[PDB]
Structure formats: structure tokens, C-alpha cells
């Protein structure tokens, strides 16, 4: 098993004795002060924690599947000078079909890693939808300057 | 060593054991009477043969 040992080397280089630090409180003391003899007293050895015994997950009473179909696959998007914001609320959002699929050329997320999006739980989601020229996609980022 | 520095090495060709030591370094101190007195100084090389 993986344990911690302390080994004693004599003048010729041979191991003559050893202690196992995980066996006893006394062996842990001998490993902490690095000696085979201990004086009388009280020595602060280590720190202790208590490991957990269970798991608790609490999410609310939401059942409706989330309409990601209407936002992405829609007949008409408005032009960039008059974009539209749509509010999404009270849904269970899978989020895996966005990064598993090869549909999207740029999937760039700021402040959240995409893989952790399926665990987090939000208040509302707002989707802003518009259409831009091919080189104007780079200007959709925080703190960037251009006409768009 | 006790400080986990390499102190001994076995020669690969001859299987001879040999010791590595650091070649000398240290501090250099200058002993002077004073600029107004004289421009001669003495030099102390600390802890070296």
C-alpha cells in the first residue's frame, strides 16, 4: 500500500531500522520530530478533519423542456441595428446539444466554461439574436472597438 | 548529502568512487585606515586556504 516510511542509515549505508508513520500516534510523533527517541512533554503533531458521509442536491420544481429550437432555428432574424432580446424562464435546459454538435463555427463563452453550464442554475436567460457580415463576428466581444 | 546535494559519484568507465566538492568562493572585505590618512588597504578573503 502507499504509505510513508522513515528509514535509518548507518555509516556504511545499510538500512538498520525504520518506522511507519501511519501506524500509531507515537510513530507519527517520531516522524514529525525526526528521531527514534522522544523527551517528555506535549508536542503538536498534526491537524484533523472529519470526512463527509453523504450527498445532497436540491433543485426546484421545473419540468418543461426548454425551447432552444425556436431561438436557433427560426425563419427571420432582425438586422443588427435593431436586434431582439428574448427571455427564457421556467425550463430545463440540456445545454449539451450546443457544444456536442458541429453546427456552430464560434462557440465562445466568457465567465463560464461550457462544460460546467449543465450543472449551474440561473434566474433567467436572455437571448439576443441578429445577423452580421462575416468579418463582423470578431467585434462581438467585451471591450472591443469598431463601427458595429 | 544530508541537504540532498550530490557529494559522491561512481566513475562509469573504471568503477571508481570519487567525491565532488565545491571549488572555493566567499566574501571579500577591505581593511582601510581612511582616505585622509593613506591610500593603502588590506584584503581579507573569508574562510579559504
Amino acid at each position: 500500500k502507499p504509505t510513508t516510511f522513515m528509514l535509518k542509515y548507518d555509516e556504511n549505508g545499510t538500512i538498520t531500522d525504520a518506522v511507519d508513520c501511519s501506524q500509531n500516534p507515537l510513530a507519527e510523533l517520531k516522524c514529525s520530530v525526526k528521531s527514534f527517541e522522544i523527551d517528555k512533554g506535549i508536542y503538536q503533531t498534526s491537524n484533523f478533519r472529519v470526512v463527509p458521509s453523504g450527498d445532497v442536491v436540491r433543485f426546484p420544481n421545473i419540468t418543461n423542456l426548454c425551447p432552444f429550437g425556436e431561438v436557433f432555428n427560426a425563419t427571420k432574424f432582425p438586422s443588427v441595428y435593431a436586434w431582439e432580446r428574448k427571455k427564457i424562464s421556467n425550463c430545463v435546459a440540456d445545454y449539451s446539444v450546443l457544444y456536442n454538435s458541429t453546427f456552430f463555427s464560434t462557440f465562445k463563452c466568457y465567465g463560464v466554461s461550457a462544460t460546467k453550464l449543465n450543472d449551474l442554475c440561473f434566474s433567467n436567460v436572455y437571448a439576443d439574436s441578429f445577423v452580421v457580415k462575416g468579418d463582423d463576428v470578431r467585434q462581438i466581444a467585451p471591450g472591443q472597438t469598431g463601427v458595429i | 548529502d544530508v541537504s540532498d546535494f550530490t557529494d559522491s559519484v561512481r566513475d562509469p568507465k573504471t568503477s571508481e568512487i570519487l567525491d565532488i566538492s565545491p571549488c572555493s568562493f566567499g566574501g571579500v572585505s577591505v581593511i582601510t585606515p581612511g582616505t585622509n590618512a593613506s591610500s593603502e588597504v588590506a584584503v581579507l578573503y573569508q574562510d579559504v586556504n
Binding site: 549505508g13 511507519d20 516522524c31 | -
Partner: peptide, 30 residues
């Protein structure tokens, strides 16, 4: 049957030669 292995199974951990030390190591040990 089952028995006890008291202070047995220690080995030289590595290639290093050391003398007059108490050396702490973490490795697979009995």
C-alpha cells in the same frame, strides 16, 4: 489461514547512497 507480518518487507527505495541520516520517503510499502 492468516498471519501477521511484523517489520518485514522494507527495501531500498532508489539508487542513492546515504549514510548517517534519517530519511523520510513515500512509496509503495508493506
Amino acid at each position: 489461514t492468516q498471519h501477521t507480518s511484523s517489520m518485514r518487507g522494507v527495501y531500498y527505495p532508489d539508487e542513492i547512497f546515504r549514510s548517517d541520516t534519517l530519511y523520510l520517503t513515500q512509496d509503495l510499502f508493506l
